[PDB]
Ligand binder design. Sequence first.
Ligand code: HAS
Ligand code: HEM
Ligand code: OLC
Ligand code: OLC
Ligand code: OLC
Ligand code: OLC
Ligand code: OLC
Ligand code: OLC
Ligand code: OLC
Ligand code: OLC
Ligand code: CUA
Ligand code: CU
Lengths: 551, 31, 166
Amino acid sequence: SRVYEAYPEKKATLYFLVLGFLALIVGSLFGPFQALNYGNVDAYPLLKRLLPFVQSYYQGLTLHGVLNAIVFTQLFAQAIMVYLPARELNMRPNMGLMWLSWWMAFIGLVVAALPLLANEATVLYTFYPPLKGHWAFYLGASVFVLSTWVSIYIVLDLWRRWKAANPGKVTPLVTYMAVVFWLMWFLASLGLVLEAVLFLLPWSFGLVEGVDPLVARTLFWWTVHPIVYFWLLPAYAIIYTILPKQAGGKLVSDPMARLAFLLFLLLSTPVGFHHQFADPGIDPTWKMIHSVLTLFVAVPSLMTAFTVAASLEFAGRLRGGRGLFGWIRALPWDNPAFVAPVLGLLGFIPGGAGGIVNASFTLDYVVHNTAWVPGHFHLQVASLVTLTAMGSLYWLLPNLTGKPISDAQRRLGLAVVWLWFLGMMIMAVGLHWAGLLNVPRRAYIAQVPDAYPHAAVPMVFNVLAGIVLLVALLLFIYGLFSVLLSRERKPELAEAPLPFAEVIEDRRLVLAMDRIGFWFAVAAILVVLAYGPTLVQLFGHLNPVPGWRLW
Amino acid sequence: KPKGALAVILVLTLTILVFWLGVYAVFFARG
Amino acid sequence: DEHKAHKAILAYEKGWLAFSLAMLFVFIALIAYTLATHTAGVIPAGKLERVDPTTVRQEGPWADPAQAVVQTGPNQYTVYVLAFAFGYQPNPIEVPQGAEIVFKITSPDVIHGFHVEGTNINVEVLPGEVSTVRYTFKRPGEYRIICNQYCGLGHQNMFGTIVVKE
Ligand code: HAS
Ligand code: HEM
Ligand SMILES: CCCCCCCC/C=C/CCCCCCCC(=O)OC[C@H](O)CO
Ligand SMILES: CCCCCCCC/C=C\CCCCCCCC(=O)OC[C@H](O)CO
Ligand SMILES: CCCCCCCC/C=C\CCCCCCCC(=O)OC[C@H](O)CO
Ligand SMILES: CCCCCCCC/C=C\CCCCCCCC(=O)OC[C@H](O)CO
Ligand SMILES: CCCCCCCC/C=C\CCCCCCCC(=O)OC[C@H](O)CO
Ligand SMILES: CCCCCCCC/C=C\CCCCCCCC(=O)OC[C@H](O)CO
Ligand SMILES: CCCCCCCC/C=C\CCCCCCCC(=O)OC[C@H](O)CO
Ligand SMILES: CCCCCCCC/C=C\CCCCCCCC(=O)OC[C@H](O)CO
Ligand code: CUA
Ligand SMILES: [Cu+2]
């Protein structure tokens, strides 16, 4: 194929995409089981006959989160947030680096997967000390994530190269998102890299006897809030700069898109305590600060809601829709690439709503570590992000492989997308409600079937969700494999342009927002100011404690 | 006027508000 | 028309950005309120209070569970709780209703949840550190403690009891 000779980025992107879905499928296999568990139905015996290496509920839970929320989400981000900026500027990504990063990812994953599958790392995707996993888990995880540092460099390169060719022109939209995105991720990632290097790796290696739980946790959450925005923004980039076209309309504001993204660079990292509201040894004043700063990080998505909604109504009116609801039925509901993100956006309403509760200091005490939290995050990542990623099969895959999407396959796509959406709404109800009834998260509750009698109603939703999603999953596997392993190739698809939207004015803001070095340091100050004082007191009073293996 | 978008942000508002006022009520009941 | 729809969208978006900001501020105000009331008692003490997990069952306040309840004021008791794989000591925790209860909770092994069903008590317990929270039980009877932090294979069955005397 001469298409790859000239556009080799298509192949590397494809690789990132395929590995990502492979991880999604394998990770998700465990979900229905878990769903049935939260419905007080124990189907683990069956799962263990099918996959004999699985020793417990918790090993499946470790696989599910790592594979789904770390691996797939990261691979997606890497695919989107390199390929898209590259196509907009019409430039070649540094291919040497592009393959290095893929191999880093692949190898790290391979390495983490070994102790994971062998039952040697059944911590969770949070691997809190002193629960102590196999060194291979920490190493392979570490290497996997560091892959993104190469991605950061790659996009930074493209960006500067373009800027050299074009001094005193503002950054093109998609590329601006990608640049603020990857820089945000660089700040964000220093928490975990720090944790892994100073603590986790030495510890798993036999180098230090103990780790300090609270410092470990504090560093961990430095990263693992912004990581969610890292998951979210590849989806948004699509929702902003592609979806408007797929809908039949335009993006209603370039500046608004830039500003949302700007706010994410500034506000995505200095918030982590909102995961530590119930931790000892952190001053309550610093919790209140992080609380307020968290409410602030809701702003860009609040803004997003309006910008995007308006973009939808706009396309809806352009297609004939009249009334207050007319524009809705006017939109291309026969297109899976249109439907998946929009359905994901609907769920984001209750999703963000629950987030906002979570953020409010004392209110967190109601919901912390109950089923509510999974309820919240399935709506955010397992629905919005995953569904956006799903719908791109129907535009991105043909773009990358030149392989066509039959009408049959378009139909099955609508089904998968819808069943997946509903199943997630259904489970979202069961989880939030069960959460409100004090049902703990991360628990093989079906194995204590008398513990939670009050939860009987939400439980039925969890079962229903379980089966509905098993179906969606099954259909998703069969659909992806029909479209990857299909017969035909029409390279004219692989050569088509991506469906970027046009924009339908405030140059002065735009110029300001383009002073990227400046905003980057503002971000970095905000992190020092938000985390410095606490981390300083913490490092000065370390109390390492021995590791445990309790599985 | 973007009446459709306004509907949406209205739904989003009421959702937040039912969620937030709800759990606030619950916090005080459990306080 | 396209010119006009852009004007209107931007105008209204601005309205909504002010309103959503307002709403966000009002929550901040309502959160602060909670911080000024007795309900704030469940917020951990921010103080670092380091202990040794390996000897905490041998010496110190967690070593004799039957003496874990100590009157620290005219209407105040401190309770020294150990959350461990997989349960709580003492069991049951016995306290009087309407007295202010300072819980000082620690673990000798791994992290555990301390979530008192029916209350706002919900605190992570970390080995090496003492988690200190305050609550005043209004109603007598039996309240169950749930561990809601994954702590290993015994996690799903890790429960404790508090009994509030009339
Ligand atoms: C991609 C993944 C996720 C996103 C995004 C995310 C959003 C937020 N989160 Fe979160 N969450 C928390 C706060 C929030 C807040 C304030 C936001 C906000 O950024 C959300 C703002 C968004 C909105 C305000 C919604 C706007 C709505 C939109 C954009 C849709 C409009 C629809 C349209 C336009 C469609 C209309 C079209 C038609 C056709 C009608 C807190 C604490 O403050 C915790 C800890 C809780 C605890 O006790 O552990 C937490 C923990 C989690 C965890 C679990 C961590 C763990 O395992 O321990 C994960 C995985 C997660 C993921 C995600 N989270 N969250
Ligand atoms: C077939 C769909 C899936 C089902 C039915 C499902 C259901 C579940 C259930 C019931 C839980 C709670 C388990 C517990 O607290 O014990 C869970 C947790 C989780 N899910 Fe999923 N899920 C699926 C897909 C996804 C996807 C696509 C993602 C990521 C994109 C995801 C990420 C997570 C994470 C972060 C965990 C938390 C693990 C932990 O607490 O350590 N879910 N899922
Ligand atoms: C096409 C994809 C969507 C499919 C959606 C199908 C919904 C689930 C079945 C409904 C029929 C009613 C079945 C109920 C009868 C059996 C219930 C039962 O026996 O209860 C379980 C038992 O308590 C535990 O072991
Ligand atoms: C317990 C909760 C479970 C219940 C879950 C329900 C959640 C919301 C479902 C659908 C809303 C979607 C509204 C928009 C639907 C658009 C389809 C449409 O209008 O179709 C046009 C027609 O086909 C000509 O093209
Ligand atoms: C775009 C999709 C739309 C998203 C919008 C969906 C948000 C749903 C909001 C509230 C549901 C909760 C029901 C209302 C609260 C009932 C409270 C109740 O039943 O009280 C508890 C009582 O103590 C126990 O017996
Ligand atoms: C066309 C396909 C549409 C079908 C979609 C279903 C409609 C939603 C309602 C019920 C199904 C729920 C099935 C739940 C499975 C059994 C529930 C269960 O496990 O019951 C426990 C009981 O409450 C204590 O003993
Ligand atoms: C689209 C699917 C998304 C799923 C969305 C999940 C539904 C949760 C909704 C609202 C929670 C509001 C809190 C409800 C609590 C109300 C109880 C109440 O009224 O509180 C006073 C009482 O005294 C206390 O015990
Ligand atoms: C207790 C609180 C009750 C909450 C109940 C829901 C309130 C509705 C929410 C948001 C509307 C935001 C839209 C802002 C409209 C502002 C007006 C505007 O932007 O007007 C410009 C136009 O040019 C003029 O001629
Ligand atoms: C445009 C008009 C401008 C006006 C807009 C102002 C917004 C007002 C909203 C909330 C105020 C907060 C009131 C604080 C009262 C909370 C007390 C409470 O709820 O107390 C429960 C409990 O029983 C005690 O311990
Ligand atoms: C669609 C979404 C629907 C969501 C449905 C919402 C249901 C939540 C209800 C109540 C939570 C409030 C708990 C109130 C605390 C009182 C419990 C209590 O007093 O029980 C233990 C005590 O020990 C005995 O002596
Ligand atoms: Cu102790 Cu879970
Ligand atoms: Cu967070």
